[PDB]
Design a protein around this ligand. Structure first.
Ligand SMILES: [Cu+2]
Ligand SMILES: [Cu+2]
Ligand SMILES: [Cu+2]
Lengths: 147, 241, 382, 148, 51, 147, 52
């Protein structure tokens, strides 16, 4: 099984309330008692949220910002980014017991989006990505890689 | 944990594809914001695509993200295509928006609203980054290559638009005629920060001087944004927000 | 439709367009529509907007549904930025060629250096046909006729696709191997020195040499083909001819001006001074793209837009003919639904309650004289 | 502000208090402090409390400046009570043209001079709060130099 | 220019377009004092509560 | 006794000369042989100088700078600040054997008082105050506080 | 009009004429609101004794 086909798959304020609330209430309190096999299955779903976040940033900051240049998406990617943040912090190890600085910057910058200075804050995706790779390389590092 | 070697490689490949997707699209969005909110006016219109302001400004403000993304990708994975992926993402966003909104909703012709070409500059930047991997040599030579080859890179596209035309008794370029004909409500002619002449230009030196100034300021911007991206690449875990 | 959204006082006293005439109302593709008229740059140009020392005569449509084939101010072509003098009156003439079928606006508007758009009155123009029939030929000084609808499009696609293909080929060449996690682990766990090695360095030297050589050869080819090229022409045109209007023989001084809040009427008191040897009558009050006309003295026959035309919206308490030399004080009321449709009643929300406009005086002979008025506008509530 | 208004503006000179009254910032300060404490995260403070400070500044002073914005016909030209006060009580060093105020623009649409300015102030106040939090953090050090 | 008299006799009436006559020497002074004192009192109450 | 009623309680150049000179010459060389009880009595007097410094900064940078806005104190608070600096450095422990950076900034900034950049240097009073609190919490920390 | 073609040291050469500031002054060059009438030689081979 592992990764499933989630990859293929007023209102804005309301949607953020349940999605953050449902995700935060459903946090796993017993994070230590977590097998590495289910970690990798759970660790993909965090990457799916990041992929959904990149899609939302692309659909918001590319197709719609210059759309006014020829002349909704901002709250959509705000909700997606904060949901990915909450998912990482709660479900994943190596993201709990502390707030990741690049992940927080990536979530907040485009959220708070003069926008030139703020659009650079999406470069924190590099630190986010290296942190996610470190999260992947916890139990599933080997044996194969580096061999 | 993990089952076997082969399926571990399959998982690594799947993660590679997903991470490439996420990084590519985030870079597209952010760098498209940066380009359109720092440079976008010149890139929109052929008559705006002049030889002084266009050549000076575009490389200076478009080496920003390639510098940072190289500083991250090369140092962390030995992947020498940060500049290339940034430029390809910008070009993809530019072109889809030209074809679907400029030509789709409005009807500005493609030969009028075509974007600039930066792949030669990105390729030079990446190859100089990898060969002799020193970041300082990159910022010194590859940045000059990026600045210098920007105008001859787009010259095969804009040369047919610079053919002189006698238009109603006054001399014009094909790009000038296009801008005059296809009206732009929000972008009048006087906003065109273009080559309007100067008493301190000597001969055929509007383009080479602008190209070299862009190359040097692109060296500086690359040097700054390499460290900006290095800071953005940290893995710090705050404890108290 | 940007007009009306702007400040009421800024619209009233920036630029006044009058004697507008559109050549045709309904046209087909490739046909020409000609817009003629005169615009007068107001003497009391607002300080917050930079002077039209560098201005451009544009035409406002939703995208290039019409191509501006020609545009003249005075008698000379003005395709680039121009300098306008404060208080002078210019006559403009724009030739538009139909390109897209449907119903569109026109907006006798303009653009100034530090104020952006200044939308003038616009008229609905219907275009029939199909876009496929449109043609925009032009003949270069080199000696060939080219169509701007598809000129250089093939070359643009070819070069952009070629460079995108080179970039994608490079990224795929370095993406066939495993990308992120194994390479990160190898570079972290001591020196890697194995992810980049021959013949990757050789093929990247090949990429760099190919890119530079291709750029140089393409530049040489674009210098062989199209051997005659000129830079982009630009630069504000000065020495620009205004109209030499005769000095008006009518002197009007405004003693206060009021408008009902809420309301659709503007009431003001006038002291018309008559000179010459003809009996004049006030016929039209143009404030901001809105023409208040008195039907008993003047009727419009230029096809002015209905929403901006007040056939009987201008009422004068004593509109009897004014003998030359005789001066009288009369109350003028300009009431129309357009006053609230085009948001002329938000001057109360504007930070400068002053209006400006043009008064058109007609006599029994038929010829008209234009005089300008500008006075503070005092809202009333009780 | 208030002691100087009462003892120097109204004491030595005689500018009226209703003319030289200062602004009110207590609502903004209270929002900033309460947001700082509740959910003590400094970033949430700089994001939400700074917006509160920027946004509530104008409605905070509105009960004071609203009576001064009543329109008046003053010698044939429209005026506010504040405008009449400034016109009457002469200011030798502060003439009218120095007044960097709303003088109109061709890029304003309807009743959006105040909300747009309020939101711009809120965002730039977010930025200034973020900068000055670290400036104060540096100023809070306990370093002991050894060689000045 | 010599001025004789007392400041207490001075008056600066003005009539608004709303339809009331107000004295600019003391117009809105009471409201200004009330609101400023109220906000200062709220601030002092908060600081005293935590002090 | 402890704190006494000191709290209730050309020329500028001359006044600085004696006040700095008298305070610097009267420094205690045997700082180690200093009982904690006399420290607290001495440690209050340093706070009195800071209170006199805040009064002088307030009387100089508030009542007199805007006084020109409607249109001596600077040297007064300069002297007070440098006198407080010398008193702390000489008489107090935990302030000797080194120059305090925030204390030096607080003394110098308003002294050197374009003044916008310089007026921020008075924010170093926060570091000054936390350092003074640490000086208080040396022998008189307990027992009571933290219990 | 130049007063003389060949002169000796300490002698005076007088340059007279009229210059007309063009109506179509280019926008890229700031208006001569503040201008100075100079004389162009390779270094002070002539001293500008007077200029009217
Ligand atoms: Cu319209
Ligand atoms: Cu006019
Ligand atoms: Cu001439």
């Amino acid at each position: 099984l592992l990764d499933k086909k989630w990859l293929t798959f007023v209102l804005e304020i309301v949607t953020a309330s349940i999605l953050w609330g449902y995700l935060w209430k459903t946090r796993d309190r017993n994070l230590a008692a977590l097998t590495p096999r289910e970690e990798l299955r759970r660790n993909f779903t965090h990457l799916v949220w990041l992929v959904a976040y990149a899609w939302a940033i692309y659909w918001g900051a590319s197709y719609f910002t210059e759309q006014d240049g020829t002349w909704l998406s901002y709250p959509i990617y705000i909700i997606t980014g904060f949901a990915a943040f909450i998912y990482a912090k709660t479900r994943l190890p190596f993201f709990a017991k502390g707030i990741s600085l690049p992940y927080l910057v990536l979530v907040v910058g485009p959220f708070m989006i003069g926008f030139v200075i703020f659009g650079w804050l999406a470069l924190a995706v590099m630190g986010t990505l290296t942190q996610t790779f470190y999260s992947f390389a916890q139990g599933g590092l080997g044996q194969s890689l580096c061999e | 944990a993990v089952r076997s070697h082969a399926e571990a490689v399959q998982v690594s490949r799947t993660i590679d594809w997903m991470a490439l997707f996420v990084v590519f699209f985030v870079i597209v969005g952010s760098y498209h914001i940066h380009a359109m909110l720092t440079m976008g006016d010149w890139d929109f219109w052929s008559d705006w695509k002049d030889r002084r302001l266009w050549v000076t400004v575009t490389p200076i403000v478009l080496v920003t993200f390639p510098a940072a993304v190289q500083s991250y990708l090369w140092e962390r994975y030995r992947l020498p295509w940060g500049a290339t992926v940034c430029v390809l993402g910008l070009l993809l966003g530019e072109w889809i928006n030209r074809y679907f909104n400029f030509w789709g909703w409005t009807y500005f012709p493609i030969n009028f609203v075509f974007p600039a070409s930066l792949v030669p500059g990105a390729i030079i930047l990446d190859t100089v980054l990898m060969l002799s991997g020193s970041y300082l040599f990159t910022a010194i030579v590859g940045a000059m290559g990026w600045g210098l080859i920007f105008y001859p890179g787009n010259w095969p596209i804009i040369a047919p638009l610079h053919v002189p035309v006698e238009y109603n008794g006054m001399l014009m370029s094909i790009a000038d005629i296009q801008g005059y004909n296809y009206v732009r409500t929000g972008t009048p002619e006087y906003i065109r920060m273009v080559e309007k002449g100067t008493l301190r230009t000597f001969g055929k030196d509007v383009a080479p001087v602008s190209a070299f100034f862009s190359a040097f300021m692109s060296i500086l911007i690359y040097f700054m944004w390499h460290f900006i991206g290095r800071w953005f690449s940290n893995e710090r875990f705050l404890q108290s927000t | 439709h940007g007009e009306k959204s702007q400040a009421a006082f800024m619209r009233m006293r920036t630029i006044h367009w009058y004697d507008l005439s559109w050549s045709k109302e309904k046209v087909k593709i490739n046909e020409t529509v000609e817009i003629k008229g005169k615009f007068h740059v107001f003497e009391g140009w607002p300080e917050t907007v930079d002077e039209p020392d560098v201005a451009f005569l544009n035409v406002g449509m939703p995208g290039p549904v019409f191509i501006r084939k020609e545009s003249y101010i005075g008698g000379q072509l003005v395709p680039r930025s121009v300098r306008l003098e404060i208080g002078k009156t210019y006559d403009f003439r724009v030739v538009l060629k139909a390109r897209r079928p449907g119903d569109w606006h026109v907006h006798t508007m303009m653009n100034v250096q530090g104020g952006g758009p200044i939308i003038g009155p616009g008229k609905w123009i219907t275009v029939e046909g199909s876009m496929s029939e449109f043609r925009n030929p032009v003949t270069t000084l080199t000696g060939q006729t080219v169509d701007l609808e598809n000129y250089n499009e093939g070359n643009t696609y070819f070069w952009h696709a070629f460079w995108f293909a080179i970039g994608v080929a490079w990224i795929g060449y370095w993406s066939r191997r495993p990308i992120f996690i194994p390479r990160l682990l190898m570079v972290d766990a001591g020196r890697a020195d194995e992810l980049v090695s021959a013949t990757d360095r050789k093929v990247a030297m090949g990429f760099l040499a190919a890119t530079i050589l291709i750029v140089v050869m393409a530049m040489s080819s674009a210098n062989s083909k199209y051997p005659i090229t000129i830079p982009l022409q630009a630069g504000t045109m000065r020495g620009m001819k205004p109209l030499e209007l005769p000095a008006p023989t009518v002197s009007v001084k405004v003693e206060d001006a009021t408008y009902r809040v809420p309301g659709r009427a503007m009431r003001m008191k006038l002291t018309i001074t008559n000179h010459g040897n003809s009996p004049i009558r006030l016929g039209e009050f143009y404030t901001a793209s809105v023409r208040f006309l008195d039907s008993d003295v003047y009727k419009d026959t230029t096809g002015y837009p209905e929403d901006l035309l007040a056939e009987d919206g201008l009422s004068v308490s004593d509109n009897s003919p004014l003998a030359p030399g005789e001066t009288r004080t009369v109350d003028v009321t300009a009431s129309d639904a357009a006053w609230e449709v085009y948001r002329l009643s938000d001057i109360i929300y504007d930070p400068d309650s002053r209006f400006a406009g043009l008064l058109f005086f007609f006599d029994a002979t038929g010829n008209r004289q234009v005089v300008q008025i500008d006075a503070p506008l005092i809202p009333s509530f009780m």
